[PDB]
Amino acid sequence: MHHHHHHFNLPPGNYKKPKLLYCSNGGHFLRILPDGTVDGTRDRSDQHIQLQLSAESVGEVYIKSTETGQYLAMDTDGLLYGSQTPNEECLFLERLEENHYNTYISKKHAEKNWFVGLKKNGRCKRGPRTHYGQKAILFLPLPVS
């Protein structure tokens, strides 16, 4: 294993069932819209917030929309998008944080600590704007309906 210059505290659980990824920062579920944009919604019955995680190798995940099949990805300038096909920008290091939450670090940009993050207004943060210590990067995985 490479550790990619990060800790290796992992959250409990498996990838058997889909999840909601809930961010208490603004109270949003991570959403991958069919046009490829990514944001958050407070609408718990939205049909684009159900996500299937899968593990490449241990602690490295794909995050896929169950509705559209799109993969969460982060591009070269730190913007989240939904990708039709899996590529190196779709891999995230899923780690435990504060002994409690899940965080997701872009594997491609792991050396810069670019996280998946949702602002209080439900918009995505750009990679460079995310940091340890922010509520924006803290997620709770929740069972779907």
Curated annotation (Swiss-Prot):
Gene from which this protein is expressed: FGF1
Pfam families: FGF
Entry comment describing in which tissues the protein is expressed: Predominantly expressed in kidney and brain. Detected at much lower levels in heart and skeletal muscle.
CDD domains: beta-trefoil_FGF1 (cd23313)
Subunit structure: Monomer. Homodimer. Interacts with FGFR1, FGFR2, FGFR3 and FGFR4. Affinity between fibroblast growth factors (FGFs) and their receptors is increased by heparan sulfate glycosaminoglycans that function as coreceptors. Found in a complex with FGFBP1, FGF1 and FGF2. Interacts with FGFBP1. Part of a Cu(2+)-dependent multiprotein aggregate containing FGF1, S100A13 and SYT1. Interacts with SYT1. Interacts with S100A13. Interacts with LRRC59. Interacts with CSNKA, CSNKB and FIBP. While binding with LRRC59, CSNKA and FIBP seem mutually exclusive, CSNKB and FIBP may cooperatively interact with FGF1.
Residues reported to bind heparin: N25
Motif (Nuclear localization signal): 16-19
Keyword Phosphoprotein part of the UniProt annotation: yes
Entry function: Plays an important role in the regulation of cell survival, cell division, angiogenesis, cell differentiation and cell migration. Functions as a potent mitogen in vitro. Acts as a ligand for FGFR1 and integrins. Binds to FGFR1 in the presence of heparin leading to FGFR1 dimerization and activation via sequential autophosphorylation on tyrosine residues which act as docking sites for interacting proteins, leading to the activation of several signaling cascades. Binds to integrin ITGAV:ITGB3.
PTM comment: In the nucleus, phosphorylated by PKC/PRKCD.
Compartments where located: Secreted; Cytoplasm; Cytoplasm, Cell cortex; Cytoplasm, Cytosol
Protein name: Fibroblast growth factor 1
CC annotations in GO: cell cortex; cytoplasm; cytosol; extracellular matrix; extracellular region; extracellular space; nucleoplasm; nucleus
Chief place where the protein resides: secreted
Family: Belongs to the heparin-binding growth factors family.
Segments of this protein annotated with the region Heparin-binding: 119-135
Keywords recorded for this protein, A-Z: Acetylation, Angiogenesis, Cytoplasm, Developmental protein, Differentiation, Growth factor, Heparin-binding, Mitogen, Nucleus, Phosphoprotein, Secreted
GO biological process, one term: positive regulation of angiogenesis
GO molecular function annotations of the record: fibroblast growth factor receptor binding; growth factor activity; heparin binding; integrin binding; S100 protein binding
The organism of origin for this protein: Homo sapiens
Effect of K125R: No effect on LRRC59-binding
InterPro entries: Fibroblast_GF_fam (IPR002209), IL1/FGF (IPR008996)
